[PDB]
Structure formats: structure tokens, C-alpha cells
Amino acid sequence: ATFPPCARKMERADGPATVLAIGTANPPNVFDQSTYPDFYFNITNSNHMTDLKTKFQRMCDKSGITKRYMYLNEEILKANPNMCAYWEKSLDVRQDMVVVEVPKLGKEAATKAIKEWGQPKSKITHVVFCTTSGVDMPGADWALTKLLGLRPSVKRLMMYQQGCFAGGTVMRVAKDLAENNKGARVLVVCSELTAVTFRGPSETHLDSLVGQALFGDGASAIIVGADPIPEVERPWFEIHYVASNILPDSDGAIDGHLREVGLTFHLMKDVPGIISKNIGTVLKDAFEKVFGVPSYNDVFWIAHPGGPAILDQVEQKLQLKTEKMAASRQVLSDYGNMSSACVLFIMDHLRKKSVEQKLATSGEGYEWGLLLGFGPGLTCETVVLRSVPLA
Amino acid sequence: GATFPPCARKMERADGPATVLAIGTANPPNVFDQSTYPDFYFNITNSNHMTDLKTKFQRMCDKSGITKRYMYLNEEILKANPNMCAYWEKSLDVRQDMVVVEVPKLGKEAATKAIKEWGQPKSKITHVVFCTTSGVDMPGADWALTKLLGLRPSVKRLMMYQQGCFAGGTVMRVAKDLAENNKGARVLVVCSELTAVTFRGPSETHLDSLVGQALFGDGASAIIVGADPIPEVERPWFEIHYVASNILPDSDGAIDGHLREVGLTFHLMKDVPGIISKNIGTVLKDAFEKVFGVPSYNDVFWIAHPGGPAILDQVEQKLQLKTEKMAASRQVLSDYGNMSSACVLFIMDHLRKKSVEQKLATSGEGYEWGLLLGFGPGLTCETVVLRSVPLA
Ligand SMILES: O=C1C[C@@H](c2ccc(O)cc2)Oc2cc(O)cc(O)c21
Ligand SMILES: O=C1C[C@@H](c2ccc(O)cc2)Oc2cc(O)cc(O)c21
């Protein structure tokens, strides 16, 4: 039924997939969240909606966000009233920005990780590009290859319209890319701009208004590879286990539609409830596969900060000491919800703070840890990591 | 820069090559004869007065190598939406309404056929890869297919949106690493394309857009890919041995596609069949050196994405292939048109059945090795070196 077998024609690697470098970047315009409602209702000329604006200040005050970064600014928004309206034909100007600027922002981040990695660009064999902001053909992955000058033969994978969970998904993809091909070095970039989703306020769509309070811009990048060249490359985290789950009872919890008015956002279920109701069995299964088992308080946490209530209730139902979501709360506070890019921001922050504080490992002195993606589906991606030992 | 002491791989990997274990296809119900499509198209777009354009379109249609296409769009549907029959009126929203529903739906038909031939319970599918360039949504068509098929909540999904005609080669490259790096992985790969996003009226000043209206058709195909097959339970059809991607030289801008409020727009800004056929020699000889260190182009089997007849004709020409090499690729073009990422999988199915039916020695026309090729928008060339299985 088969021809005589032959040796693996493309040699695989032997160790686990490993993060060799992380780099991040953000657009230049900073918005303090405490005065965001004044700004938002000005630039959308909706100051007549007094009660709604009061509702919005509530949402921002409780978002857990201190500031956000945006490609958009007051100059750009006044030039584009159709994006300042709530529901106006827009999609073309929105595309015209993001198809250019998300690979640009991904380039900044990619270049920092490449600098930290320190090997020549030519040793990059795969590119994985992930975004929720706009689509084009050829894709941002191709544009990133052009902007960087990688080999024309890099193997590319373009991930469009993914949602907040794909920070976890890119780990699972790069895991197989790096481990099945010997010598592979995977450049992974998540780049997100809210220009597809900024819109004016509407008194009958408060869920859209939550989005306006939570979403910010940012790009994150990592270099993943197996069998790191000792004394030349530097490991920071190891990918050991990956899993994906559509949580029970979550049909229709979050939807997003790309329409003539841009990307629209729709909440219809208790997202933090469903996540914290089901996270225990998700992580129990994972820990059984991986170990046979350490506590939840004795691993490092990298969790996507969908909103504060997600981290709050996961912290509550799993009885985590408040220090566990710290690195995750810290990123949400400095940047808001950057969709897929958040977890690589948390991962970078976690390792840097581990070094500065001279802890035993790169995961706050713990050996094992979790990366968690949350989004539409409701979809949960689970990534069990190992850190590296540190001085 | 130290490392915790190594431990055995947490997730066991497979050892054999990724193997195709089943193929299924499906098409929408509405059939459009190619010879009289010009009469139909120019009438439904209210342009019978564009009389020189029509005769140019009849020329493209007759010289397209296509005998018929299948489409979700029918007559009735198109009159419901005059903004889609215009060349350039805003209509993305009615397009999205169609394809976010019908893309997963047609993929379900193909996937169910595939699972039936595969023979195993659908509960043993561990991975889903959904490939399309018809519309986007959150959650994606990959989520909807999981729902309509009733697969496990915990399938590892990969959602490929807005890909291009090369991605039928990309899914194979994607599924190769999924299957090989995960012992017992069984990957459902589905490509599903509907022209509802790309259909639009004619324009004298955009004959590239008009080329697409002559070549693009609808369809979906699905495969099951796994490594280390269960002996006597599963049946291997092709093995994936080597994959490669190249952006062809100086091909900057040859094929673009933009999703706008008027839908998906299509542009040819260079000589595409020339660029492919000028460089495919270099692409193929590198792949053959990698896997063989060596069979001749006429002694392998060919699954070539038939973006249009000129491409196949000029690859046939400059590699100097005996004309039965591209036979199977032309057959699918003739019977279906260009179905974007779904074509090479239709060709793979037709190739193996033609081989079984004519009692040849392997699933690949009697050859051990073969090529699957994708072409699209970098200009990107996807290369797959495959092996057949012996039949008797
Ligand atoms: O509507 C959006 C915008 C998107 C987004 C966030 C930040 C960014 O920078 C770019 C896009 O995030 C989302 C995530 C979802 O799960 C569902 C959604 O509808 C959206
Ligand atoms: O314009 C389109 C539409 C798409 C398509 C084909 C058939 C089908 O049924 C659905 C979509 O194929 C493409 C492939 C490309 O490389 C570039 C493009 O611009 C396009």
C-alpha cells in the first residue's frame, strides 16, 4: 500500500521550540485614559450625549488601563469624519491606513527582536504574521518580508482577522514549524491597529462603546527556534504543550464583522464568567498531559487581558494570589487590550522584570508557566511554557 | 545562557511522512456553460451596448480552456443585488452576508465526503485548517465548520483568510508540519472559494478585472492528512516529502487583490504566465536537488494550479514537457474553471481516480514522484514534492 519508506527528506529538530528574542513597538500617539472620554466625545462631536459620556467615563475608569497607543490622532480623525461617525461608509480609508501601517509597525518590532537575536536576517526561514486589522493581497506577511529584506524563499503564513486569542495560536503554529524542520528560525509578528474599529458612539450599542474603551495599538515579535546554538543564541522560554478549546455554552459570545463601516464588535454573553467558569478543567487537562503536578500559584502566568474582569474572575475562581496576574495586569495598564499582541508584551515584560529583580528564572523564578489566549469562539488557547534559569 | 535540563518531548511526534488519506470535493448547484457565458454576463450587467468589449470577452472565454463553471451566484440572486452587477458600486455588505454563510457550508459538503471515505470517526480529527479568499468573519469559517461538522470542542484550528491562488500549496505545507510533529494528529484541510466576492460588471479600462470574470469559478475540496497511518484501516494516497515557497524575481505587483467596499478587486500588472514560466525552471531544479541530490520532468506526475491556460501552456513550453503531463490540470480547468486555492486539490482527486480507473501502477499516473504547484500574489510559488502509492 506504500512505496519503500525513505529517510525524512526534510530533517526535523530534536529539542523543543524556544523563544530566542522578543521585541515590541507602538505608534507614537499616547492617550491617557483618564481624559479619554473628553477626547473621544470631542473628536466624535457627540458631546450632546451627556448620559452616554457619563457611562463612558465609567467604563474607562474601570478598564484597568492607564494609557493607550494609537496610530490615529486628532489630525487624522478630523481629516476623516466618516471614521468619526458611528456608522458611515469607511472601510476604504480604514484599509488604506492599516494595509500600510500594520506591517510597518510589525517591522519595528521584528527589527528589535532580530537585533536582540543577533543572527543575520538570512537565517530566518519562516515568517508568521498575525493581525486583526485589515486584509490585503499580497498580505502583511509579504509586506513584512519586503520591508525587512528576508530571503525570497522564506516560508510564510498569513493569519488575518483572528481575534484576541491568536497570540496563543501563533505559539502553537511556530511550535510545529520550529520542531519539524531542523535549523528553522521562525519570525513571529502580531501587529494590531484600532483604525479598523474606531467609531463614534451610539446610545443603543454600549458593547461597541466598551471596545472603544479597551482596544489599543501595538506590535509584538519573537524569534522561535529549536536546538539553540549554545553561546550564540539565548533561550528565554520553552514551548512544551499547546491546546485549543471552544468553551462550553459560549456560542455567540463575541462576534466581529468586517463591514462597509469597518470592523464592528459585538458582546452578547458573560465573557469573564464563561472563561472563569471553564478555565479550571482546561488547565487541569493540560497539567495532566504535561506532568502526570504543580500548583497554580507556583507557575508564572501570561494571560490575555481581555478586560479586567477576565483576570479578576480567573484570579478568583482559581484562588490565585494577587501577584500572579500582575505581569498581565501591568501590560493592560500600560497599553490596554492590544488583541493578539498582548501576550507577547506580557512575556517580554515578565522576562525583563525577572532579570532586573534578579530572580531565579525568566518567569519570576518559577520553572513552569502558562500562556493563555482568549477570544471569539469562545476560544481558549493554552500554552504550557518553561522558563530558563537565571543568575 | 543556560537551560533547564532537557526532558523528553512532552507532545510525542510522528515518524513517517505526512500522508493524504482522503479527498472530497463539492460545488454549488448553478452551472454556467462557458461558450454562452458572455451572452449571459453582459446582459445581466446591463452592458450589451459595450459591443467591442463583449467580443473581447467572448475571445477570452473561448480561449480560456474552460467548459463550464459552478457558482453560488445564479440569475435570481444577482437581480436581487444590482450593486453586484455594477462594475463599481458599494456591495461588500451583501457579499459578506452570502459568503460568511456559504463558504463554510460548501466546505462542509466536501469535508463530509472526505470523512466518509476516510472511514474514521470524526471524533478522531485533531486539527482543522480552513483556507479561503472569499470573505472574513469572527469567529472564522474554521469555527463555523467545526460547528456544522460536530467535531470536538478541542480541535486545534488554523484559519487562513484572504490567501490567493497559491494557498492550495500552502495548506499542504501547513498540514505537513501539523501531522508530522504530533503523533496521532489527523488534520482536516478545507479550501472553499465562492466568486460572490469578486463578481462585478465590465469596464473598458480594466480588462484585467474582466479576465477574472472569465476564469474564476466556485468550489471546495477537503483532505485528511495524517502521519503514520493505521495499516489496513487507513489508506494512503500521496505522501508529502518536501515543500518550498519562493517569491519570484522582479514579480513585484504582478497580482494584487484588494478588499474594498465594492468587494474584492483583482489586478494583473505584469505578464504573469511569463514570470512563472521564466522562473519555474530554477524553482523546480532546486527542489529536485534537495530531495534527490534524478527523475526527469516527464517522469513525475503534475498537479499544477491552472490560474489560466497561458500559464500551463508556457510552463509546458519552456520546461518542454510532453503534453500529457499537464493533462490532469487542464481537465479540472475545463470542467471547473479556476477555483483559487481549491484547484490543486481537485486535481489531486481527479488524478488519483483517473489512475485507479485506468488500472495504472500508482495513484499518480504510474509515477513514483510528482509535483503540486501553487501560484498567486507575491508572485508566490508554492512547491510540493509528493510521492504516490502503488495500486495494482
Ligand atoms: O472589533 C475588534 C477590533 C480588534 C482590534 C483590537 C485592537 C487592535 O489594535 C486592532 C483590532 O479586536 C477585536 C477582537 C475581537 O475578539 C472582536 C472584535 O470585534 C475586535
Ligand atoms: O480576485 C480574487 C478572487 C479569488 C477567488 C477566486 C475564485 C473564487 O471562487 C473565489 C475567490 O481569487 C483570487 C486569487 C488571487 O490570487 C487574487 C485575487 O484578486 C483573487
Residue numbers in the entry:
A (entry chain A): 7 to 298, 304 to 402
B (entry chain D): 6 to 298, 304 to 402
What do the study authors state?
The crystal structure of CpCHS1 was elucidated in the apo and presence of its final product naringenin, and detailed structural comparisons of CpCHS1 with EaCHS from Equisetum arvense and PpCHS from Physcomitrella patens revealed common differences between CHSs in the local conformation around the active site pocket.
Chalcone synthase, a well-studied ubiquitous plant-specific type III polyketide synthases (PKSs), is the first key enzyme in the flavonoid biosynthetic pathway. The biosynthesis of flavonoids starts with the condensation of one molecule of p-coumaryl CoA with three molecules of malonyl-CoA through the catalysis of chalcone synthase (CHS) to generate naringenin chalcone. Functional characterization of two chalcone synthases (CpCHS1 and CpCHS2) indicated that CpCHS1 can catalyze the formation of pinocembrin, naringenin, and eriodictyol, respectively; however, CpCHS2 was inactive.
